[PDB]
Each structure stands twice: as C-alpha cells, then as structure tokens.
Amino acid sequence: LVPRGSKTFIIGISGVTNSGKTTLAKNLQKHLPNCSVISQDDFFKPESEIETDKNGFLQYDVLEALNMEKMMSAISCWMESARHSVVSTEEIPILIIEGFLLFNYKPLDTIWNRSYFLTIPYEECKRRRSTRVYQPPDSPGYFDGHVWPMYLKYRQEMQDITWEVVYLDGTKSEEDLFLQVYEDLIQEL
Numbered sequence: 377l378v379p380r381g382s383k384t385f386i387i388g389i390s391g392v393t394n395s396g397k398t399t400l401a402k403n404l405q406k407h408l409p410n411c412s413v414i415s416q417d418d419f420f421k422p423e424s425e426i427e428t429d430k431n432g433f434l435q436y437d438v439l440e441a442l443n444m445e446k447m448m449s450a451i452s453c454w455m456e457s458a459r460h461s462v463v464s465t466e467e468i469p470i471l472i473i474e475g476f477l478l479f480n481y482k483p484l485d486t487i488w489n490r491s492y493f494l495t496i497p498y499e500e501c502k503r504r505r506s507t508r509v510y511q512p513p514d515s516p517g518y519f520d521g522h523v524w525p526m527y528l529k530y531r532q533e534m535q536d537i538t539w540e541v542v543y544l545d546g547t548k549s550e551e552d553l554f555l556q557v558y559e560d561l562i563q564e565l
C-alpha cells in the first residue's frame with residue numbers, strides 16, 4: 377500500500393479588502409474536519425520597513441509589505457503538524473489560507489487545490505473600509521489614493537493566472553457565502 381499521512385488539501389480565499397474573507401474561512405473551518413486557517417494579515421512587516429509614496433501614502437497593499445518568507449514557513453509548519461494529525465491504521469488534513477494578496481505570489485502558484493476570490497464594487501468596499509480601524513489608521517484619502525488602485529493592480533496581475541479561480545459576490549450574506557463555498561468544496565474533497 378502507498379503510505380498515508382503526506383496528503384493535504386489547501387484552499388485559498390482571497391479578495392478585496394473588507395469582503396468577508398476571514399469570516400468565510402472561519403465558517404468553513406467550523407464545518408470541516410481537521411482544518412486550520414492561516415491569515416495573511418498576520419505577516420505584515422513592521423511600519424519602518426513599509427515605504428511611503430510621493431503623496432505620503434504608506435505602501436501596505438503590495439507584496440513588499442508582507443513577510444512572505446515567514447508566511448511560507450508557517451505553511452510549512454502546518455504541513456509538518458498535518459503529517460502527524462491522523463493516527464496510523466484517507467482523512468486528508470485541510471488548510472485554508474486567507475488574505476487579500478495571495479494569487480499573485482508565484483512561489484504558491486501550485487499550492488492551491490481550490491481558490492476563491494471575494495469581490496465587492498468600489499462604492500460598498502469604500503463604505504465598509506471606513507468602518508474598520510487599522511494600525512496605523514487609514515489616512516485621509518487612503519482608499520482612493522492607495523487601497524483601490526492597488527486592488528486594481530492585483531486584479532490586472534491575475535489576468536494571466538495559471539489556475540482556475542471561483543469569484544464570489546461578497547455582498548451576499550455570510551451564511552449565503554458559506555453555503556455556496558461549502559457546496560463547491562465538498563465536491564472537490
């Protein structure tokens with residue numbers, strides 16, 4: 377027999393800011409066995425390593441703002457743990473990686489067994505963004521001056537993507553999105 381324990385199923389949830397990515401990941405995780413979640417936002421660099429543009433906007437919404445080597449190390453640590461998560465006697469451990477900037481990171485371009493992408497239009501995204509507090513906070517004009525233009529850059533970067541993505545309407549309710557993804561996912565596992 378082919379030894380078990382080495383298989384994993386990795387799900388990517390990306391999408392624009394404030395589109396429900398973290399909540400979706402957590403709702404899926406509550407309904408999937410032996411499932412972990414890694415969040416991209418846990419890997420931002422310290423503000424001293426973050427550059428500022430001509431107009432004084434901090435450059436957070438770009439891969440250079442993230443310690444992606446550290447995030448890879450976290451993925452690898454999950455994989456090591458996953459190999460011991462099922463006692464020997466297939467139950468395939470699940471990882472959900474969720475973050476606003478995943479699908480343009482080339483070292484991970486072959487990791488994704490399923491990929492979802494949450495979308496919300498400009499107006500509602502801006503509204504939702506204004507309800508959240510970041511550290512540091514959004515400066516005046518930050519949405520138009522940085523967040524949205526960087527999101528558009530990301531979407532254009534994804535124009536030549538080498539795997540399939542399922543795009544989701546992030547204006548749908550949390551339960552609606554959970555059920556849609558769960559219905560898809562349980563056919564892929």
Ligand SMILES: NC(=O)c1ccc[n+]([C@@H]2O[C@H](CO)[C@@H](O)[C@H]2O)c1
Nearest residue numbers: 393417420436437476510511512523
């Ligand atoms: N998590 C952070 O330290 C941080 C700092 C400044 C801005 N952000 C915003 O987080 C979003 C990703 O969820 C990006 O759009 C950043 O602007 C995060």
